[PDB]
């Protein structure tokens, strides 16, 4: 009989996890505080790691990547993408940022204006987006820099993708989700399964004072979008509709257009860190689960945007998911007495 | 060289002390007559802990028989082991104490309990480094009840710093002899929660059930009962009658078993209880569980109830004690709901490679759990439905006592059992 | 020449200096019965062991060191043991009752009436040194002598020797080798009142070395035989600078200034590699590069915590037998683009590199298997604090519902000296947090 | 990478490498103290024994 613990009671993609255990009839849920546990399904912020893996006789297993954080903020994943030389400053893939330090407080104030000013003397196009961890859009360095010392924490600024593809008919922008599940072993699993989070309102280059058209989030077009659902179902369309829309409007498939920028920036971000956070030596064991945000452009070029270390799943997905999850991530380690739904990235270790 | 005084006082006392030096003088290798014939030197690296030494290398168990009548002593010295006590130990009266807890502590025991006194100092004087003392007695009778909670008393008023730790026998209507046996049980409670460091309570109801389902007896009599108080006051003292890797004296373990000073009420358990497909082997795993199984138990309780505030688990015999580990590890890791989060670490397990006579291995649990509460709100209610009528209160009356005493002894109890309580929840 | 006194103090204590005498007299060559061969200066010398080692008229090489213990079983074995001729009965004190793995007992109870005592034989063994440096102490953190006489001891030298430094080697307490659970009390009792009194502790623990012996040298259960002899091999390689010609770590005060930036931040990680069975059909030799490799393992560290996410603030690689500094550099260049070592910005990222010719020495008939070369790296790291805070937690379960206390008390132990020392220790893990932030 | 300070014996030698550069209670208080908590068991044991006597 294996024990388990619940540390956060706001996961809704660990609370069916949590769900599928105990219907197995082989898993047992201790109270939150009890250190006698196989798993644990700990908290977002500050899990004490320090106290995993010292309790004898039992192997120890976490929901939780120590140090991921790096990649799952967006300072950090700015600062990470620079400073690696894996990923390079040249990196192909992630838009120009930088790291701003609101004035009230290293930074990268006069490196983005040097950009910025280049940008300006060139003709080209010079819209930024500013964002932290309460966004804007402005085409005016001024603007971007007075919202960030109006504020006290750090904030990102970087090149706001001006040529998104737009899906048709409703010209609108959107993005795609991507979950990924790394095991103790630090395998690189690919849920198959993608949800591309549209928006439902006309994409206006000439206003980005209106964020309802730029920003995809499911939040935004629930709120302040007045098209919400018209083209999809709570403006989420799946790989099967999308692919079968690049076929009919482009001429191509989602593997070979997007999806193998998918795979490739995956393994470059995850493989970077693999060194710093990996758990084969360690006297506990550590997975997680992330979702990978990433913007395609008129040329076909995928861009990642951001990483999410607690992410939600799409409803009519988290039973596949979560599933996917007790099988190679729990199961693996504790096994119980297809057609795999991930698709293994490979790599070196 | 720590230095333990045994004191038996009583029926009950008495008979299962008599036991318990007959099977530990067997495992030392302890004759009938104090000479030693053994064959291995772990036998006698902790002999002066139970044994004194006298000319011609004898052997002298450190025990005083104590009683207010001469029959059951008198037993005792014709009895298997009897010529190995010394002669002077043997403190006792004529008049009896009538099975009333008064006799014991107030009058008859009063006139005896110096002469007792004068013995226990003899037998500390000679000590090197004295642990303490412990006694073997019964809660349900006059002698081993009243005089001998009499005792420890004045033992620690004479030795206040020095371990107390009893084998105390709880009544039961299964296997009773009077009806003031709550009574006098009540009585002797509040004497323990207060002079005691360590009790281990030794429940007839748990002894004669597991006699009659488990070992199959028809008829279970005291004999019967005391074969397994023998085997675990055997298993309880391993540790110290033996060497290992375990350097533990009675407040070592007295501290690392009693997280609060009231609550010192143990469950004490054995393994096997084989009926006799007594020849088969038993594996750790089956050594594990029963022990751990409450029909093995001996308080009476289901630990089931409560909460385990601590546990001490000891292996005997030749066994793997990488697998022993796998399995206490097992049944605390598969069962972690009965022991209580803020004390960790709380199960602690200890090895003696020399098993029981007759038994490749063997396993002796000695649990601190609030299910122990069972057993003095059993006390305390056989007390109430007699005492709320005053009957058999006259015998009682009659040595002086008030109904006043009663009361408080009422309360005391009912407190004992309020405190269990607040830890289990 | 300057002398080193070895104190032991409790079980731990006691029984981990016996293990490391005896390997002190294989290493410089003395017999059991005292005599050095290889010593051509009879009665007397400063030479680098004289550190270590005193001499009689009759060429006996006598340990600077002082065995203390409230119960006579366990310091009754070295007074029969195979060295037993090495020290005399002024060396060994003992008491008949011990402090019941009770901190109260050993500080307060017992402690008063044989300090002085103890304080004496220290005295006869410093009027037999010219230039004192100070003193090494070994005890558990568990025990109630280790911890509670301990502390006392420490708080007197500070007074009877002001200007002499003090290190400690101290065994943290792990569940899989103890059946005490009041250590957590007494553990944070010692380190409370013995903090401002130590130079610098290294901590071991139990658990660490119980693993390291069942996984590379197939113990199935350690005994505390198996668990001494691999740590006065840690022990042995963090003195060696003390006892054998050499430039760094040549007296105690050098390992605050190498090792110790902040005086309450006092507590090294130890790493150590290799570690190989002998029962081995025989094992393919590491190199420099695979043992220094290997002190960035979290497997092979005296305490179990992950160093990649803590910040270093000194870097000491003691290396023993076949090592030359060229590839100790080609190493160090090698982990460096490959390891996640990030140092304090106040402090140089550099390591301070020792290098001493002769193998390790392995005790005959030990777990242990002769390999030409090894190295224990002693890194202040941060991340060590993961210890504290496991402790300061198990603390916190218990004195919440205050089980235990009345033994503490009992012995004239006031409560709040529990909460004292429990905020002390909070203001020790706030230190480590403030020092490895970004 | 720079090494400094090197160090040779017979017995051994010792350097330096750099990868990168940077950016008590008096004797009366004591027996104050022990004899505090020697009092406090003093005092619990009187209570004791008053406890026993009544
Ligand atoms: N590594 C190692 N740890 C030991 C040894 N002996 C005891 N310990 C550990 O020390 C702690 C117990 O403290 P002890 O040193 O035995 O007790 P003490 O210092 O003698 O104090 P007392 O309570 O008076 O006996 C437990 O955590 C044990 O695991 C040993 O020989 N080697
Ligand atoms: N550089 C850029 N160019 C174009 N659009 C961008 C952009 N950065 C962000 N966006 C838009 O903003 C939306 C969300 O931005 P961002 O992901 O930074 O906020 P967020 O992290 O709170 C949402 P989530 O964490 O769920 O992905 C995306 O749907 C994307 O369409
Ligand atoms: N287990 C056991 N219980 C006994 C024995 N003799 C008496 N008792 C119990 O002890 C109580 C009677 O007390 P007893 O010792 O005979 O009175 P005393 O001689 O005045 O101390 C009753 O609960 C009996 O069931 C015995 O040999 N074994
Ligand atoms: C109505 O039932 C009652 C009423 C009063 C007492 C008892 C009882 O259980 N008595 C007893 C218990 C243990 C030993 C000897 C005993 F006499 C039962
Ligand atoms: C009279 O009571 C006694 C007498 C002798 C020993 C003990 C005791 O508590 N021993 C013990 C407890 C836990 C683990 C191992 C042990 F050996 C109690
Ligand atoms: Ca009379
Ligand atoms: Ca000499
Ligand atoms: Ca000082
Ligand atoms: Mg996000
Ligand atoms: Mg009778
Ligand atoms: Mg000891």
Redesign the pocket.
Same mark, same amino acid.
């Given at each position: 009989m294996y024990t388990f613990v619940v540390r956060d009671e706001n996961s809704s993609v660990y609370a069916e996890v949590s769900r599928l255990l105990l219907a197995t009839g082989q898993w047992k849920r201790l109270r939150k505080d009890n250190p006698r546990f196989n798993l644990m399904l700990g908290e977002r912020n500050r899990l004490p790691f320090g106290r995993l893996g010292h309790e004898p006789g039992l192997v120890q297993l976490v929901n939780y990547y120590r140090g991921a954080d790096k990649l799952c903020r967006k300072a950090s994943l700015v600062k990470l993408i620079k400073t690696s030389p894996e990923l390079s400053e040249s990196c192909t893939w992630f838009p120009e940022s930088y790291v701003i330090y609101p004035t009230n407080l290293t930074d990268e104030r006069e490196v983005f204006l040097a950009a910025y000013n280049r940008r300006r003397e060139g003709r080209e196009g010079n819209v930024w987006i500013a964002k932290s961890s309460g966004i804007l859009i402005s085409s005016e360095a001024s603007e971007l820099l007075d919202f960030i010392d109006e504020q006290g924490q750090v904030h990102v600024i970087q090149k706001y993708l001006e040529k998104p593809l737009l899906l048709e008919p409703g010209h609108r922008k959107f993005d795609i989700r991507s979950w990924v599940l790394v095991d103790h072993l630090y395998n690189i699993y690919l849920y198959r399964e993608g949800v591309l989070r549209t928006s439902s309102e006309p994409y206006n280059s000439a206003n980005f004072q209106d964020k309802t058209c730029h920003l995809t989030n499911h939040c935004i077009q629930k709120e302040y979008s007045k098209n919400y659902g018209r083209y999809e179902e709570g403006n989420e369309m799946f790989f099967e509709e999308f692919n079968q829309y690049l076929m009919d409007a482009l001429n191509t498939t989602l593997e070979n257009s997007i999806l193998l920028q998918i795979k490739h920036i995956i393994r470059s971000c995850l493989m970077c860190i693999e060194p710093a956070i990996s758990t084969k030596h360690l006297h506990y064991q550590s997975f997680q689960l992330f979702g990978f945000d990433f913007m395609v452009d008129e040329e076909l070029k995928v861009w990642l945007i951001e990483v999410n270390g607690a992410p939600a799943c799409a409803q009519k997905l988290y039973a596949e998911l979560c599933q996917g999850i007790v099988d190679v991530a729990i199961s693996s380690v504790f096994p119980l007495a297809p057609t795999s739904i991930f698709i293994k990235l490979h790599h070196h270790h | 060289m720590r230095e333990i005084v045994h004191i038996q006082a009583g029926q009950c006392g008495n008979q299962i002390g008599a036991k318990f030096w007959e099977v530990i003088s067997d495992e030392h290798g302890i004759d009938p007559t104090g000479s030693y014939h053994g064959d291995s030197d772990l036998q006698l690296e902790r002999i002066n802990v139970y044994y004194n030494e006298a000319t011609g290398n004898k052997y002298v168990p450190r025990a005083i028989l104590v009683d207010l009548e001469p029959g059951t002593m008198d037993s005792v010295r014709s009895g298997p082991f009897g010529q190995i006590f010394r002669p002077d130990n043997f403190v006792f009266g004529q008049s009896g104490a009538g099975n009333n807890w008064a006799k014991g502590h107030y009058t008859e025991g009063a006139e005896l309990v110096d002469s007792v006194l004068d013995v226990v100092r003899k037998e500390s004087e000679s000590c090197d480094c004295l642990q303490g003392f412990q006694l073997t007695h019964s809660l349900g009778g006059g002698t081993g009840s009243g005089m001998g909670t009499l005792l420890i008393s004045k033992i620690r008023e004479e030795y206040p710093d020095r371990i107390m730790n009893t084998f105390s026998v709880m009544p039961s209507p299964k296997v009773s002899d009077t009806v003031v046996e709550p009574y006098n049980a009540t009585l002797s409670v509040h004497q323990l929660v207060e002079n005691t460091d360590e009790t281990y309570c030794i429940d007839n109801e748990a002894l004669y059930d597991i006699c009659f389902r488990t070992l199959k007896l028809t008829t279970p009599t005291y004999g019967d009962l005391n074969h397994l108080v023998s085997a675990t006051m055997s298993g309880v003292t391993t540790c110290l009658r033996f060497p290992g890797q375990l350097?533990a004296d009675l407040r070592?373990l007295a501290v690392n078993m009693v997280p609060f000073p009231r609550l010192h009420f143990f469950m004490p358990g054995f393994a096997p209880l084989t009926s006799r497909q007594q020849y088969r082997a038993l594996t750790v795993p089956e050594l594990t569980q029963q022990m751990f199984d409450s029909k093995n138990m001996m308080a009476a309780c289901d630990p089931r109830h409560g909460r385990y505030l601590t546990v001490a688990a000891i292996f005997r015999g030749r066994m793997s004690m990488k697998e022993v580990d796998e399995q206490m590890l097992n049944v605390q890791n598969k069962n972690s709901s009965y022991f209580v989060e803020w004390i960790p670490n709380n199960v602690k397990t200890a090895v003696c490679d020399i098993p029981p006579r007759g038994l490749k291995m063997s396993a002796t649990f000695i649990g601190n759990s609030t299910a122990i509460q069972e057993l003095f709100k059993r006390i305390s209610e056989q007390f109430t439905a007699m005492f709320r009528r005053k009957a058999f209160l006259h015998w009682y009356t009659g040595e002086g006592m008030d109904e006043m005493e009663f009361t408080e002894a009422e309360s005391n109890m009912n407190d004992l059992v309020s405190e269990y309580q607040q830890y289990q929840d | 020449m300057r002398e080193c006194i070895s104190i032991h *103090? #409790?079980? @731990? #204590? *006691?029984? =981990?200096g016996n293990?490391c005498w005896e390997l002190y007299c294989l290493e410089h060559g003395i017999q059991p019965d005292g005599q050095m061969p290889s010593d051509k200066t009879i009665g007397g010398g400063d030479d680098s062991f004289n550190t270590f080692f005193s001499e009689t008229g009759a060429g006996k090489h006598v340990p600077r060191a002082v065995f203390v213990?409230?119960?006579p079983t *366990?310091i009754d074995e070295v007074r029969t043991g195979t060295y037993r001729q090495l020290f005399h009965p002024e060396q060994l004190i003992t008491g008949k009752e011990? @402090? @019941? /793995?009770?901190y109260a007992?050993?500080h307060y109870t017992?402690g008063k009436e044989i300090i002085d005592l103890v304080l004496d034989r220290i005295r006869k063994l410093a009027d037999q040194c010219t230039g004192l440096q100070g003193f090494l102490v070994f005890?558990?953190? #568990?025990?109630? &002598? #280790?911890?509670?006489? &301990?502390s006392l001891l420490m708080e007197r030298l500070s007074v009877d020797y002001g200007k002499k430094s003090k290190l400690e080697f101290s065994?943290?307490?792990?569940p899989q *080798?103890? &059946?005490?659970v009041v250590?957590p009390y /007494?553990s944070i009792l010692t380190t409370h009142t013995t903090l401002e009194h130590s130079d610098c502790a290294f901590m071991?623990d /139990?658990e660490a070395?119980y693993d390291i012996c069942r996984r590379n040298l197939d113990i199935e259960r350690p005994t505390? &035989?198996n668990? /001494?002899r691999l =740590?006065s091999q840690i022990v042995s390689s963090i003195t060696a600078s003390l006892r054998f010609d050499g430039a760094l770590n040549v007296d105690l005060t050098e390992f605050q200034t190498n090792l110790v930036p902040y005086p309450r931040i006092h507590f090294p990680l130890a790493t150590y590699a290799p570690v190989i069975s002998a029962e081995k059909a025989y094992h393919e030799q590491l190199s420099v590069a695979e043992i220094t490799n290997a002190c960035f393992e979290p497997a092979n560290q005296m305490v179990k915590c992950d160093p990649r996410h803590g910040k270093y603030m000194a870097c000491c690689l003691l290396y023993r037998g076949d090592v030359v500094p060229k590839d100790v550099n080609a190493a160090i260049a090698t982990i460096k683009t490959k390891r996640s070592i990030q140092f304090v910005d106040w402090c140089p990222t550099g390591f301070k590199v020792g290098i001493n010719y002769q193998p390790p020495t392995v005790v005959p008939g030990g777990d242990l298997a002769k390999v030409q070369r090894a190295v224990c790296m002693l890194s202040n790291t941060t991340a060590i604090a993961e210890a504290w805070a496991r402790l300061d937690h198990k603390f916190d379960l218990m004195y919440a519902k205050r089980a235990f206390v009345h033994w503490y008390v009992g012995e004239g132990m006031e409560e709040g000296e529990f909460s004292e020392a429990r905020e002390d220790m909070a203001a020790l893990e706030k230190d480590y947090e403030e020092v490895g932030v970004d | 990478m720079e090494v400094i300070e090197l160090n040779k014996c017979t017995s051994g030698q010792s350097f330096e490498v750099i990868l990168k550069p940077p950016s008590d209670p008096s004797l009366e208080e004591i027996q104050k103290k022990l004899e505090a908590a020697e009092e406090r068991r003093k005092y619990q044991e009187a209570e004791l024994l008053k406890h026993l006597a009544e």
């Open positions: - | 350097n070592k | *103090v #409790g079980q @731990a #204590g *006691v029984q =981990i293990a213990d409230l119960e *366990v011990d @402090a @019941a /793995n009770n007992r050993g017992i005890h558990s953190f #568990g025990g109630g &002598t #280790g911890s509670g006489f &301990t065994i943290y307490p792990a *080798v103890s &059946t005490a250590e /007494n071991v /139990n070395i505390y &035989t668990l /001494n =740590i | -």
